[PDB]
Amino acid sequence: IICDLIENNTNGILAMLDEECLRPGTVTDETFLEKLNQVCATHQHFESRMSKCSRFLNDTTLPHSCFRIQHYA
Amino acid sequence: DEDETTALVCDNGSGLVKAGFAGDDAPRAVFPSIVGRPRHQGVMVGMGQKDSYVGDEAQSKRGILTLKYPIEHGIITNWDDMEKIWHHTFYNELRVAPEEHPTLLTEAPLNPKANREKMTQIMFETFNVPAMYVAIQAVLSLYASGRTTGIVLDSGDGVTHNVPIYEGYALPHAIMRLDLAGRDLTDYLMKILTERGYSFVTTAEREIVRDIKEKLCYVALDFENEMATAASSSSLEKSYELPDGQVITIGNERFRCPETLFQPSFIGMESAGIHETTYNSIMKCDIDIRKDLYANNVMSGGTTMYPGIADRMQKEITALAPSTMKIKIIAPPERKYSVWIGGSILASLSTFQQMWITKQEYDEAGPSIVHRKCF
Amino acid sequence: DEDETTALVCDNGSGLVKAGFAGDDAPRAVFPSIVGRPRHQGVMVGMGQKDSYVGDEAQSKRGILTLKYPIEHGIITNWDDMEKIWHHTFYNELRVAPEEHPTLLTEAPLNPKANREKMTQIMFETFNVPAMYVAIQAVLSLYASGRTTGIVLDSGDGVTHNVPIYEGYALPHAIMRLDLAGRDLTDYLMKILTERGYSFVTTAEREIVRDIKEKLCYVALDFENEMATAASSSSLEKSYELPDGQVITIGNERFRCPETLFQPSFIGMESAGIHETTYNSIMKCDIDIRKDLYANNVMSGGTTMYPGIADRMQKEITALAPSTMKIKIIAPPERKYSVWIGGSILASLSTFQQMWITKQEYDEAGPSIVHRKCF
Amino acid sequence: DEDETTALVCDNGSGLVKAGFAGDDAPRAVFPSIVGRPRHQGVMVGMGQKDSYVGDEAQSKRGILTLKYPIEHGIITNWDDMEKIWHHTFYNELRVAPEEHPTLLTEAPLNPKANREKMTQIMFETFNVPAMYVAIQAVLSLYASGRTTGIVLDSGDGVTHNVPIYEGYALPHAIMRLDLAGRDLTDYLMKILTERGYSFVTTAEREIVRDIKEKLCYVALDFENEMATAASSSSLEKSYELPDGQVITIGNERFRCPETLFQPSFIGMESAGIHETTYNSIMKCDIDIRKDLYANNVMSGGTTMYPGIADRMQKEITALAPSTMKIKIIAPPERKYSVWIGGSILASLSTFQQMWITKQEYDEAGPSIVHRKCF
Ligand SMILES: Nc1ncnc2c1ncn2[C@@H]1O[C@H](COP(=O)(O)OP(=O)(O)O)[C@@H](O)[C@H]1O
Ligand SMILES: Nc1ncnc2c1ncn2[C@@H]1O[C@H](COP(=O)(O)OP(=O)(O)O)[C@@H](O)[C@H]1O
Numbered sequence A: 001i002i003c004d005l006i007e008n009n010t011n012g013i014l015a016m017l018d019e020e021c022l023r024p025g026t027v028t029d030e031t032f033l034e035k036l037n038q039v040c041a042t043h044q045h046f047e048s049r050m051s052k053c054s055r056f057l058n059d060t061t062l063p064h065s066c067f068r069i070q071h072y073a
Numbered sequence B, C, D: 001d002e003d004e005t006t007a008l009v010c011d012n013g014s015g016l017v018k019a020g021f022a023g024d025d026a027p028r029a030v031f032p033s034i035v036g037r038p039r040h041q042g043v044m045v046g047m048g049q050k051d052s053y054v055g056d057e058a059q060s061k062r063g064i065l066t067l068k069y070p071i072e073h074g075i076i077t078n079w080d081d082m083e084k085i086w087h088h089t090f091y092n093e094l095r096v097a098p099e100e101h102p103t104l105l106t107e108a109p110l111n112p113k114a115n116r117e118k119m120t121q122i123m124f125e126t127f128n129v130p131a132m133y134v135a136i137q138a139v140l141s142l143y144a145s146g147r148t149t150g151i152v153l154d155s156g157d158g159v160t161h162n163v164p165i166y167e168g169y170a171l172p173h174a175i176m177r178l179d180l181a182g183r184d185l186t187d188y189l190m191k192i193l194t195e196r197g198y199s200f201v202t203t204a205e206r207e208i209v210r211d212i213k214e215k216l217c218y219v220a221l222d223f224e225n226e227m228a229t230a231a232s233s234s235s236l237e238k239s240y241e242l243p244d245g246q247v248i249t250i251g252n253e254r255f256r257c258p259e260t261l262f263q264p265s266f267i268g269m270e271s272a273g274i275h276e277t278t279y280n281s282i283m284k285c286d287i288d289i290r291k292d293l294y295a296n297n298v299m300s301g302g303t304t305m306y307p308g309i310a311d312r313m314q315k316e317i318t319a320l321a322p323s324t325m326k327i328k329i330i331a332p333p334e335r336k337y338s339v340w341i342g343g344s345i346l347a348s349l350s351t352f353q354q355m356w357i358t359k360q361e362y363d364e365a366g367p368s369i370v371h372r373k374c375f
């Protein structure tokens, strides 16, 4: 499930960052993190504060301009 | 977040959400209360377009959005949109968790009951605040005024209201509420700019007309003398560069726009005007209060940031009041935030800390608990 | 064939078929969209003469052929000939099987419905592609432009069109389509070369005049100053060697040929011109968009490869636009392929891969599926 | 000329000049408000070619002219061309001297000030009329309606506007102006006919599309039911023979063309629609007026000559209005002239004869005299 979250050609994080390096316009780190908040919200193992389905919104231990991945460690 | 659990004050009055922590002299978050939704198709793939933009971001992207104020005349009309406004208020602008901070909401007097009840319901059930308190906005303006005796008007974006208070005691039979404020002056300015030849009808163009109102309008002292002065020559005619284009040149509209606030027959509203509802709010009090009201007439809120509204106000009330009375229009430059600032002073009081409406008693009694413990 | 199943981009706009694979910076197949058929008897026995020659081979053998463009003004008019163009595109130039590659077709905005419907029908039924997507050509030019905000014109061989886009959102009420492009400039150049004394009327000689247009024509900045300059002396007069013969010497026709693109009354077309349809396409947008359009005026397609068309474009639009606006004509040297290149960038997006129109749903819905899923 | 000095009524609204004498039930001169100028060289010597053709003659000779409407969205934009329209109105169509007849001009509400001022200047200074009066057009529609109580919309060629009137008293704070009318529906019909495959871009071809709109378009009651009905079969598909050529066959465009008048997002105009600006114009009135407005909803002007617009109008407003209200859409077959006809009734009143703006007081006060004596 974890590898898929990074590997997938249509919503994986490397595919989204490959797209962000490809797609035109204003490309920052903030817009990439907002894209990860858009296309990885309904994933179980993705964890960010500004995710749309977030149960880690009131988690004060998550700084903005960051995100968590639920690795095995 | 915050280093402390200091209480929040969220003044969301009718058209400009301003919020911050208690003990501050100024709100840390000031943004317009708009929700913009796109009305055109998204043709660029993978850009990062959202479903709806809130506040200042919707003010930036307003060329491709439609702008909806979720609160009109002090009454919240779109609760899901207002939930977006509050979510953007705590989590995006303040970047704080509302579960750790008490919140101080402001309403207008003589409001609907389901406004404060459902606002209490969304504060406790959706955002899970530990304690809340909804308070009348002009009373808070008298807190930042530094007085316990005076009659107050604030004139927000949707509602103006007089609250006379004597020696700390509210006079709720003499509270005046007039639903004539800055959004109505924006619409009337759209009408008279249409009269000159500039057609603004779009909600983004409505915000342009709001910026014209904020930057170029002023209150005349004698409306017929300034009216005949503008009819005489081009002395008071001032030009404004539109966003992304040409330059307009407006004349008498500078003082015909806020004169509606003194003469509500311009927008067709049968009422007495802001000076005569102030005077009638004084005369509906007891007699031995009245001079202390005249010496402490407080004009300390929103829309009344026009140039020359204190001179017009003192002229009209001094014309209405009897002689040998000292009429003093308290109009600080701390306006447009003093309703919030007195929210900070009220939240920072030690003896106020029993008057918060917490959990457990909201959870005992339900959303009518404000009608127990708020005024 | 191809080592991967990478999607194809086949820009077949109106007069020059250019196609390749996604992820490439340049199309692998560029050939003119002509179908030549012999008009003379074959007298040599057993040579290997064909029924019709397609593209570059028809451009070589044009002395004994008649040349028919199967697509005119962006509208396909000979579907069997266009089937020969596509068959030559996939099987001869690219040498690939279309059953394994998705294809990205380009059209012009405000096109006939049966164009995209029957083009979809030939893509799925004749060539059996797994997925297709027909997209508006100037939007693709804004993909290769690297911007999500700007107004675009491409000016192909049959159609020029302005598409203004703000923050990724299309403005389809402000899309301008002008049917004045390089083939009309070729015909007008045939007329004014007939004025000088060189009579070109054959379709092969029409291609010679097209080569004169590509090699010797340029856009004047002031048409009367360059006109009186050519009337003054032989300073700008330039000579061209014809295919297989004599040398011609052309003068003011160098700038009278593309000035028709700015003044369409030369070819008798009642319209506003390319600069004034650009300006009117800006003014039909919302107001707070407009400066971002002026700073991102994109001129990134076909016919606009003339020398000095960006200076004339910025001169005319800067003359039309109000002052204190920054008018920036984005005209890269990546033109004449950037509509394809943005086709490659759009096909190479990860989130685009759900927007392909596949089988099974074309097979569910029929050829109106593009009017569901294409813009 | 005229046997009497009976006052003229010249309704020149935005796209169709109709004029006549007072006391008539119908205007004696109806012609389109176009000015056509030749764009081609005159090669036949001594024929009798003019510099510009006006009105019906320009409608006949439109194949070799360019057609310019001198008035757009109710606002006059070419004053010399509009001077040709008025000169043709009095001297050619009516064949009368304007120095002997008072004239009753019509404008739209919420118009530019220099429109009525400069229109007054051309009426008194160029044509030398003895008296004039500029009046709001929907008020005149309520004169021919036979009522002193009702809300009116006319929908001309450039502007639709609601004027609610109760017991003879105007409600000018509740006047709605929407700049969406028949010329915009003509342009949108040009776009969707371009979608089907028929490319009309010429101003003469624009008049052909206007004739298609007048002859074949109708307002659907449920847009999705008629939309799926046209998607089902060829039941509602109707054919039209073009001027001087082939036969076109149009389908859903019959009801997609005027549905823009109810859904202005089709042409990209952010507004509420004609039914919701009617309802909002009712709700911006005082409360004890409102049922009398619902029982006297007057739809009595121009563009609203579509089949089935009264049923759609009563459906949408009855859906918006509360229950137990009688919604009555007054839509006579006297439409497209009733704004003129109420001009004749207003000019034929005895007590109106002091309200004319004459000479000598225009000559005393200048062109602001309308802002003294017109509404
Ligand atoms: N400098 C100014 N001059 C005139 N009007 C102003 C000025 N600044 C703001 N306004 C008007 O006052 C409104 C802000 O009122 P405010 O009291 O902030 O509303 P709220 O009750 O939501 O706090 C704005 O909508 C604007 O129309
Ligand atoms: N160097 C050039 N200068 C002038 N005109 C050119 C030049 N190159 C191409 N053209 C014209 O532009 C046309 C091709 O335009 P293009 O954008 O490639 O259209 P397509 O949509 O078919 O891809 C050519 O057929 C020719 O008329």
Ligand SMILES: Nc1ncnc2c1ncn2[C@@H]1O[C@H](COP(=O)(O)OP(=O)(O)O)[C@@H](O)[C@H]1O
Binding pocket: D011, D012, D013, D014, D015, D016, D017, D018, D155, D156, D157, D158, D182, D183, D210, D213, D214, D215, D301, D302, D303, D304, D305, D306, D336
């Ligand atoms: N039968 C009809 N069906 C649909 N539209 C019509 C019809 N008759 C006229 N129109 C539209 O109404 C316009 C004329 O409106 P009118 O009120 O005469 O304009 P004006 O305000 O200039 O007098 C025409 O441009 C036409 O588009």
Ligand SMILES: [Mg+2]
Binding pocket: B011, B013, B014, B137, B154, B156, B301, B302, B339
């Ligand atoms: Mg306030």
Ligand SMILES: [Mg+2]
Binding pocket: C011, C012, C013, C014, C106, C137, C156, C339, C340
């Ligand atoms: Mg192309």
Ligand SMILES: [Mg+2]
Binding pocket: D011, D012, D013, D014, D106, D137, D156, D339, D340
């Ligand atoms: Mg009219």
